[PDB]
Design a protein around this ligand. Structure first.
Ligand SMILES: [Cl-]
Ligand SMILES: [Cl-]
Ligand SMILES: [Cl-]
Ligand SMILES: [Cl-]
Ligand SMILES: [Cl-]
Ligand SMILES: [Cl-]
Ligand SMILES: [Zn+2]
Ligand SMILES: [Zn+2]
Length: 390
């Protein structure tokens, strides 16, 4: 069995310590640790040690990472994507693998990805991402959400396909906009929860609906979550309507989400209202950070650097204080892991030995400066140095 002693690192505002790793777990933390015989030594040189970063919401199947630049002349964005996939030979396999490897090189060791599951492609995108997940076993842990991007109710056979996706290895059921997309919100929520209940799985639902319509759909989702006892098994992604509502109605919904263990994903889009990270926090709602798309036919933006996403969340929420920047960093570390149900997380003994070293004086500096990951350790193995896989 292999041991790794990372000497002389800082977890933040605290004295420096060493981190002893054995197998895939953190074995010991503290100052001036003894070295087990034959243990490898890594000199941390006073760097900040971070737990493995977490991508709580992306779309690995859609990315053009590693491909030639996608020239965007979109006007109409759902029909553009479908035409691209039906006139190009896009391979969710090489793309998802390249992007997930870039995530790893930048210190992200846990990823929740949505994958399109629909009657245009069947399970083809799912199978490609499952291949990528198997290639990266022991290197990146990947949760897969089976996402009916173009809807369920109006597309015959989509319900059975989503069930097939869960049976084939998708971890979570996805879905979207029970009013705006599905047209029959009660039927849509009942169909989706029925499928997830059959496989005993959780759900992560895209909710773009604005204002009172979004609040209505959210209420329906939370009602069903409570009725089925699906505690800590439902995630709401985007949830823009929480930025539209009066504070009274907003906090009542957030209170219900906190009670049910429902987390919210924010990707901090700069041009639409977002849930206030501090309002969620004050209500007891866990906030998960995510990129959303990364260089696909929807968006040219996105990055495998989750420190950059933390920075963008902080900017979007008008954070300036150091402790507010640390709240944003929590959205791509402990908060994202808690919200997504990523277990054995952190830098304490017994946690999975995911360790990311960065040259920064403070956690707040690491958020805004995004220093290169000097070292990435994943499941106790050194996988990257100076931002590149070794
Ligand atoms: Cl298929
Ligand atoms: Cl602030
Ligand atoms: Cl920790
Ligand atoms: Cl600090
Ligand atoms: Cl740097
Ligand atoms: Cl990096
Ligand atoms: Zn989105
Ligand atoms: Zn999304």
């Amino acid at each position: 069995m292999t041991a790794l002693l990372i000497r002389n690192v800082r977890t933040g505002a605290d004295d420096a310590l060493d981190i002893l790793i054995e197998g895939d777990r953190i074995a010991r933390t503290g100052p001036s640790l003894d070295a087990p015989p034959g243990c490898a030594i890594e000199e941390g040189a006073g760097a900040i040690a971070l737990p493995g970063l977490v991508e709580g919401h992306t779309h690995l199947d859609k990315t053009h990472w590693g491909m030639p630049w996608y020239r965007n002349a979109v006007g109409d964005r759902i029909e553009n994507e479908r035409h691209y996939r039906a006139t190009s030979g896009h391979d969710a396999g090489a793309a998802s693998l390249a992007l997930a490897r870039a995530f790893l090189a930048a210190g992200t060791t846990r990823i929740r990805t949505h994958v399109d599951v629909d009657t245009d492609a069947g399970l083809r995108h799912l199978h490609r991402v499952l291949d990528t997940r198997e290639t990266l076993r022991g290197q990146v842990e990947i949760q897969i959400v089976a996402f009916p991007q173009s809807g369920v109710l109006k597309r015959p056979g989509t319900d059975a396909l989503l069930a097939d996706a869960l049976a084939a290895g998708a971890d979570l059921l996805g879905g979207l906009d029970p009013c705006a997309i599905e047209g029959d919100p009660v039927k849509a929520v009942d169909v989706l929860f029925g499928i997830a209940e059959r496989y005993g799985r959780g759900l992560d639902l895209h909710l773009h609906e604005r204002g009172s319509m979004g609040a209505y759909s959210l209420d329906l989702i939370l009602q069903r979550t409570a009725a089925l006892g699906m505690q800590h098994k439902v995630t709401i992604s985007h949830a823009f309507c929480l930025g539209d509502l009066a504070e009274r109605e907003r906090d009542a919904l957030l209170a219900r989400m906190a009670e049910l263990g429902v987390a919210v994903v924010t990707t901090a889009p700069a041009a639409v209202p977002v849930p206030s990270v501090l309002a969620c926090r004050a209500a007891g709602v866990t906030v998960i950070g995510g990129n959303d798309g990364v260089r696909d036919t929807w968006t040219p933006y996105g990055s495998p650097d989750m420190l950059e996403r933390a920075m963008l969340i902080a900017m979007r929420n008008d954070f300036r204080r150091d402790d507010a920047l640390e709240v944003a960093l929590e959205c791509v570390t402990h908060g994202a892991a808690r919200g997504c149900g990523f277990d054995a997380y952190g830098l304490q003994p017994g946690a999975r030995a995911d360790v990311v070293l960065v040259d920064a004086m403070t956690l707040a500096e690491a958020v805004v400066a995004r220093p290169v990951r000097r070292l990435v350790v994943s499941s106790g193995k050194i996988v990257a140095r100076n931002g590149a896989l070794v």
